[PDB]
């Protein structure tokens, strides 16, 4: 055949932080809380407060907010592990503690006669394995990483070839479970990039049509 059997990976780290609520969404969140309050009943806290208020009224004629104050003081003490990792990372797009609400896909800098640009991790089909197998040896032919990841299943996810006798590109997909890249100063420029920043590295047919299968939702 006048083609070359090459597979690739789409290793995506899941979003860790919840996406922020848009203007429209927050109005409902307030509204839904309002109607939840307006249609509830039997709060033990509220009953303790009301009953103690009435018994104190009897005693004054002749508690619970202290607990509320204590709770608020402890909550004011506790600081939250912040999610402004744009400030925690400046613009280091190679680290995995960049944009936490969104989704990042791996992208490494390579060199080739056609294009010396970034590629999704590549492999060639040896005559004794599956293409899922080819992505799984990409996992071990990257640059010293403890990427532990799940593979979404045994089927392709993209076919974006070029002619130079043809690099048939067989984009697969996987999902990062827990792993991390060793050697933070990796000489191979691995960059962890979103679909919105994909246009800083991927120009046309063989690499920029990957927006078909990079799911930003």
């Amino acid at each position: 055949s006048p083609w070359r059997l090459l597979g690739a990976l789409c290793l995506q780290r899941p979003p860790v932080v919840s996406k922020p609520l848009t203007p429209l969404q927050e109005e409902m969140a307030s509204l839904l809380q309002q109607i939840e309050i307006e249609r509830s009943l039997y709060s033990d806290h509220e009953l303790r407060a009301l009953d103690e208020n009435q018994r104190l009224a009897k005693k004054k004629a002749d508690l619970a907010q202290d607990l509320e104050d204590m709770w608020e003081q402890k909550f004011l003490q506790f600081k939250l592990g912040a999610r402004i990792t744009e400030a925690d990372e400046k613009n280091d797009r190679t680290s995995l503690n960049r944009k936490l609400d969104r989704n990042l896909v791996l992208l490494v800098r390579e060199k080739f006669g056609d294009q010396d640009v970034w590629i999704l991790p590549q492999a060639e089909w040896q005559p004794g394995e599956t293409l899922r197998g080819t992505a799984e040896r990409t996992l071990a032919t990257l640059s010293e990483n403890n990427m532990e990841a799940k593979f979404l299943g045994n089927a392709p996810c993209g076919h974006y070839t070029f002619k130079f006798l043809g690099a048939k590109v067989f984009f697969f997909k996987a999902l990062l479970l827990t792993g991390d890249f060793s050697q933070a100063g990796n000489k191979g420029h691995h960059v962890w990039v979103t679909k919105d920043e994909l246009g800083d590295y991927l120009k046309p047919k063989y690499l920029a049509q990957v927006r078909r299968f990079v799911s930003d939702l």
Partner: protein
């Protein structure tokens, strides 16, 4: 009438039906009955995602065998500085679906996974002994 061309214009029991475990398809493939377990600490947010999962399966033409709830577990956390308490509850809703083609799996999974809500876990299992 039987001798006439209009015989059986009133059949209806061949249009209705009345009287599968680890199903496969050989060369092609299709998974068996799979349970989408969806536990959470919030009964509210769990129920909501189970509703979303059911509605998306119905829009995706995946057969849904049944939506059933696994028993709520109330666990008590005691910390001391006897100990005090903070009673917590985990509620679990399961969407039992039947026919998912092995090619479609990736898509369905990616989509339920991406939309997972804050604090609800998705554990898709095969119905063997979970009863």
């Amino acid at each position: 009438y039987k001798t006439k061309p209009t015989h059986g214009i009133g059949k209806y029991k061949h249009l209705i039906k009345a009287e599968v475990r680890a199903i496969n398809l050989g060369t092609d493939y299709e998974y068996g009955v799979l349970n989408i377990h969806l536990t959470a600490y919030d009964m509210t947010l769990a129920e909501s995602y189970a509703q979303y999962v059911h509605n998306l399966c119905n829009s995706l033409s995946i057969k849904v065998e049944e939506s059933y709830a696994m028993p709520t577990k109330t666990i008590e956390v005691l910390q001391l500085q006897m100990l005090l308490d903070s009673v917590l509850t985990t509620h679990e809703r399961v969407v039992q679906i039947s026919g998912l083609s092995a090619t479609f799996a990736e898509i369905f999974l990616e989509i339920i996974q991406s939309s997972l809500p804050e604090g609800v876990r998705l554990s898709v299992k095969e119905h063997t002994e979970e009863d």
